[PDB]
Amino acid sequence: HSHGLFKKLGIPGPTPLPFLGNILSYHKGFCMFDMECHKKYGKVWGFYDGQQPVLAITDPDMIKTVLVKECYSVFTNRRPFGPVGFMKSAISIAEDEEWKRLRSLLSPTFTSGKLKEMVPIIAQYGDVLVRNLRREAETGKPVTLKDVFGAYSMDVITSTSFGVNIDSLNNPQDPFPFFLSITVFPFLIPILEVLNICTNFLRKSVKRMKESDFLQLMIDSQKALSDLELVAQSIIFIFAGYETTSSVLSFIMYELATHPDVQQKLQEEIDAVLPNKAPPTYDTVLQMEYLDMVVNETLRLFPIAMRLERVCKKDVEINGMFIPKGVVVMIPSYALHRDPKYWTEPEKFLPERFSKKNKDNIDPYIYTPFGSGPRNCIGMRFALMNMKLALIRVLQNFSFKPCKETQIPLKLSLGGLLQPEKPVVLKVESR
Template identity: 45%
Template sequence: MPLLPSLSPVTWLLLVAFLCLVVLYGIWPYQTFKKLGIPGPRPLPFVGTFLEYRHGVHNFDQKCFEKYGKIWGPGRKSLSSTGRLFGVDFLSPAISSGNSTDSPSAAVDRVDFLQLMIESQNSHDGSKSAETSLDKTLSDEEVLAQALIFVFAGYETTSSTLSYIAYNLATHPDVQQRLQDEVDAHLPNKASPTYNAIIQMEYLDMVVSESIRLYPTGGRLERVCKKTVELNGVTIPEGVVVLIPAFVLHRDPQYWPEPDEFRPERFSKESKEGIDPYTFLPFGAGPRNCIGMRFALLVVKVAVVVLLQNFSFRPCKDTPIPLDLDSKGFMQPKKPIVLKMVPRAQADLKK
């Protein structure tokens, strides 16, 4: 039996051409950054630098930052994905009632997330002017998907943020005491939190901001370049995906002296004026920043206030000090954050 199959010369030629095209397809997209003169890790055919992520996305970004500087090319020119997220039915009645002209709520001028999406569906109606008409309306499936993402995306991020804040307070008792004093001053006798009281707590805002600087819920931001531009001598072609490693940016000693230290004073009124807003990106920036930013901050602050009114956080024997982040996958503690919650009455007596 011959080692190679008996094929015609034309078939062999086509087979070799096909293999060359496959190899070219696996290598060609990685030439973009080389042509632009942008340094970066050497990608493998087809998989690029994906295998480097097994050590953790933030670790990969940190190593690239230390080796290549403030800009590097991590992989392919662009990545696009289209498809259906998911579909469920429990929001359908709300969408139907919102679209119905016979609904009693149709005459109510509401400005909320769901209503704005519903109105985008009706933007091509005859009652709408040409100026307010959108280029693309949303389908029912898109409205459902966006509404569900808006509802569920905040749960994990909020809980993670609260965990990191509790850890920072437990390991910095002086900061916790000062914050409790501020809470007691604005809400004496464990009064229920109000919006006006929350927004007046300056030190609370400083503590939350410093915690999400150290541990941002989104370690990376992505933006697609819609027009070829040149910035600081670097040309960014149209269609290129630009990744902003917020985790690395938040720990750059050029912008944050002693970046690994927990110092809420960085965000005092005096110090905040000197912070470049594009070096602090826990929620992104620009027209596509996190749509739930204000709501998320308010929820976190209310939760912190209620907890500190009743408890004090203390480290225990199982508390990981220092806090090591997992090198596999996305940013999370290598070991669970375990703290002791002491009722305020007991904590005050011991103090």
């Protein structure tokens, strides 16, 4: 019934099938859908996830309008996500006024100082990361990167926010389809919101963080903060600092392997700023510009978010286009990062895109790997530091080459989340 909203507004888009909308088109993944749609319809198009209208925009001013200018007023919240349960109070899932309070309460966790407090602490598990890697390198056995990176990433997040120290080769107490049917049956979300389909593992263990850091800064600031809400924020932070940190690290190492000129040119800078394999510090990391380039260029090819979303909470007319209340506005971050109308040879890995000679010819509303505006990635600065500190210690000791079973070229997960089809396996040699 509601499948004529874009036929009405004169906005092009793929013809939706009843009930399904255009979800059958996701058979190649969200990214191949947005890339094709970006070609088919232009700067603006609209489709339907079930009965839910999605408006895709690609205009830098419209994107600046949505994510920044009209954030607090109209585009405060993301698509409703359920069933969540108590996790409705998580910052990334909370809406309107409740989200504003959580954003203020958790913002001072990633100040330039609180991050600088974390550099002496992060410098530990990188040496566990090297020593765990020196074992699988002295034996000529190819290495699953996400295993030893995730083992590292998990070690970082548990201490940077709480303080628990665990080598992630022994028992790691941290375990963690149908979401398609959720889009045809979003009416089933409130259904599952009563049968408590939301494990009690950390729901009582992290709840029993009696402690009698991020965990410190929460009870210290407790219209204040709750406790079951404190657990939910811990779950969000623990996931992000693990999966996002590890997945991107595998992405970077795959590119350094298939582009050995970029791997050596980066190794030459690390030994320069840090001679005699010096331990990386807060200020020596921010000095390395080629490392910043390699990180940014990998995030162009693999923005793990793929899409930025905002629910339009009332009728508006942004940049000369009427947008009705309830529409989910979408920024195809993946399709924008590979749009040839902005990037030269956009499928190629070229870190020189982000050189200070060329970093000005890049629109920060086309390149948006961390979002933008008041609801951008809250851990953007931390994640950049945690990854870079990891990249320094690893490349200071090991080089990386492709293996026989290394998937070249890498296929993206044609499924839901931005991951590789096959895991990233590379040979590791010792310098």
